[PDB]
Symmetry: C2
Subunit: 451 residues, 2 copies
């Protein structure tokens, strides 16, 4: 088997483990001239010198010399196309017609006083930026082992720590995380007498904390429309199958959520940067397009195989819907649909920033056995290959590798993911991250220098 993503492609990827040896033939009639490993590209037709190399329906490079059919195309046989300037990129030149809406889909969630719906019932603890740091982590640890077990309806407790002139990103991120629907309607804020005492201070905090736990323990889930979901998507260990299996499937589920009237988010500026010329045309208008370019140059400025090919594989998670809004690190959306939330690719930082943007569910695609997870929101981990789903059967919540062998289609895995999202949001199924407690501490993005 070989996988051809788009119809106009002139190259394909080998899926067979160990690759395919010379002599192997395919239905169309071509034949390999040499051995080609799995994940590497093969020429479908004879491509001439300086000839375009097409994959994902776009130019990923040019041939350095004439490449014969059925030959292995290595990174040394291609010339990368230099990315064009940002002021020359087309904006809103091809906004697709909205697909027919999906109505009636629901999930059991926790309705908040502000109208938002949480997928989890958590206790949030924070402190004013002018108070001392270290009290929140100490109190959260005591609440987890001494009180949390007495309130089973409470999914957990999360500490929101501030960092110790231009550092607006970290402050905005911590304040917006406390507005996430999984915290409900009230996060806890902790901050004359000759002898006060530290132990005394903590005793008072634990009394306030037990009052909140008793109230959260009495909350119940109610049937809510799928339009109240906010789903975030990010990549973990980039793989040769990421853009041909998991990513396209996530993009199909992304389009289904947009049709339900929900909010989907894709981030990672470093992962989509070399393909921004394919996102700008999908902006609903120019102000949203220029706002998209503004985030690209901000990150290029902050930073002081085929990168274009990998970027095309990442944007596959965005699906085909229109980009209705662009967010800066830690901002919250004001519109519903496909949103672009600028964030670093670094897994724990991306997750923390998406949680700040208000996601209630996160989908994490990966080609490596990573124990990534968050307590703030349930993390659905999708494998890119079947070999990976079998090796880490207790980490991979869903397998997209069935697309590479033709056993399942992008549409089938996409719908399977959509239904998995509603079941996780309803608490009917627990992701492996929530089953084993794979929760890594929040990592706020701090682009400002440390004093």
């Amino acid at each position: 088997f070989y996988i051809k993503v788009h119809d106009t492609d002139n190259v394909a990827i080998i899926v067979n483990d160990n690759g395919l040896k010379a002599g192997t033939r395919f239905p169309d009639g071509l034949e390999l001239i040499e051995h080609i490993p799995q994940g590497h590209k093969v020429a479908l037709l004879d491509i001439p010198a300086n000839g375009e190399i097409i994959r994902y329906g776009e130019v990923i490079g040019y041939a350095v010399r004439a490449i014969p059919r059925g030959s292995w195309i290595d990174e040394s046989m291609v010339v990368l196309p230099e990315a064009p300037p940002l002021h020359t990129l087309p904006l809103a030149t091809k906004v697709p017609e909205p697909l027919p809406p999906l109505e009636g889909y629901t999930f059991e969630g926790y309705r908040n006083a502000d109208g938002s719906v949480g997928t989890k019932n958590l206790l949030g603890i924070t402190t004013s930026v002018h108070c001392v740091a270290g009290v929140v982590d100490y109190v959260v640890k005591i609440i987890e082992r001494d009180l949390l077990p007495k309130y089973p309806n409470v999914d957990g407790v999360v500490g929101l720590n501030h960092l110790y002139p231009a550092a607006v990103v970290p402050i905005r991120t911590i304040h917006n995380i406390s507005l996430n629907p999984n915290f409900g309607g009230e996060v806890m804020v902790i901050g004359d007498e000759k002898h006060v005492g530290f132990q005394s201070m903590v005793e008072d905090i634990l009394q306030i904390a037990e009052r909140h736990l008793q109230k959260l323990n009495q909350r119940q889930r109610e049937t809510c429309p799928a339009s109240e979901l906010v789903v975030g998507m990010q990549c973990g260990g980039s793989d040769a199958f990421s853009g041909v299996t998991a990513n396209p499937a996530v993009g199909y589920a992304s389009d289904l959520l947009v049709r339900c009237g929900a909010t989907v988010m894709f981030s990672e500026v470093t992962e989509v940067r070399d393909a921004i010329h394919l996102l700008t045309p999908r902006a609903v208008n120019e102000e949203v397009g220029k706002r998209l370019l503004e985030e690209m140059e901000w990150y290029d400025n902050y930073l002081n195989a085929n990168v274009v090919e990998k970027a095309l594989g990442s944007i596959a998670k965005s699906g085909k819907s229109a980009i209705v809004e662009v967010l800066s690190p830690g901002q919250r959306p004001t519109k519903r649909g496909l949103i672009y939330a600028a964030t670093p690719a670094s897994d724990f930082v991306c997750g923390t920033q998406q949680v700040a943007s208000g996601i209630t569910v996160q989908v994490f695609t990966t080609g490596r056995g990573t124990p990534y997870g968050l307590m703030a929101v349930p993390v659905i981990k999708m494998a890119t290959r079947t070999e990976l789903a079998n090796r880490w059967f207790d980490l991979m919540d869903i397998n997209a590798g069935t697309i590479a062998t033709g056993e399942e289609t992008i549409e089938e895995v996409g719908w399977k993911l959509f239904h998995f999202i509603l079941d996780v949001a309803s608490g009917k199924k627990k992701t492996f991250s929530d089953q084993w407690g794979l929760h890594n501490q929040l990592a706020v993005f701090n682009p400002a220098p440390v004093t």
Copy 2:
């Protein structure tokens, strides 16, 4: 107390600080014969003599500014009445122009510590867990949490377990600081020179079970280690400031500087950091360098940080003079870059950010086994890697946070104790903490915040 007091740091000073809570009202007289003309709050400066216009303002024996207008004696000097002196260029600062004569050595001082195979001595018996930079991250934090609740309780002689995480994506141009820092932390003596390295299908739960068996083998071996009498020369003490206070440089800092000189005399290694806190006073550290190469190396770290950073305003030069007071009077024998380890013994300058958790993490990487943390605020700062001795600047603070302040230096402001007395009291407190005879409040309540490696490179 109806006894009015002011604290004059150096003999040549023409200004002092009011110590009485609520300050001193006009009419109050002092032994020398001075008298206040107006009310002056605590922490604020008072003129000891009539200072003329453009006249020098001296504190800590150095010029902190010039008077905007003629200042009469016994008057309150606010930050709007002084003009900061333009700082001179770094290439024009004198190097090794005044290296003090080495003081007579202190012999016989010891502490009960854990001798390592490399010759170092630890003050704590910890389990270090790390992973190769090419492996996936998140496994160490998960395993450490399971070891703390399921195995650690079975091995009481083990003080605790610490996870050492690398950077998300790496192999370099500027990302040498975080790699060097994580590698040097595993060489810290409190890990005993034996950190754990972790990195039909098996599955994730199965992988962890194997790691817990390797972890239980290490805990059983560490649980059998015992402390041995070691010379105080094997100590490595780090010093940093927390909540800057008006008394920091007149009480706790000078006392820490006296204990710093005692440790140097014992043949131990002392460290002071925080580039942002000492930057506006570098012209007083450069002359104490043992030689020019160490002096230019000191200026090199100042400009590296300046480059990296590219009545509501206190005097920055005045605050900096108060911070360098922790360095004492010994000679600076070596300068380190963020996360480097020393090759010489004595007073060392380890460049690090002032940010409390990052400074601590970087000093632990440099090899400190004990840290002294001065502060004027009730902070719950602490580290698991090394015991943290928290020193209060005011007696009012030591009483308000009696379960956080390990030692009180506020007795200097009221004249009940001297810099020398509090300095020796700190030195003996350090030996007792290093021996495990006394437990700091940070280790008693478990005020341990996760390590925060300094990452000056942008995150992708």
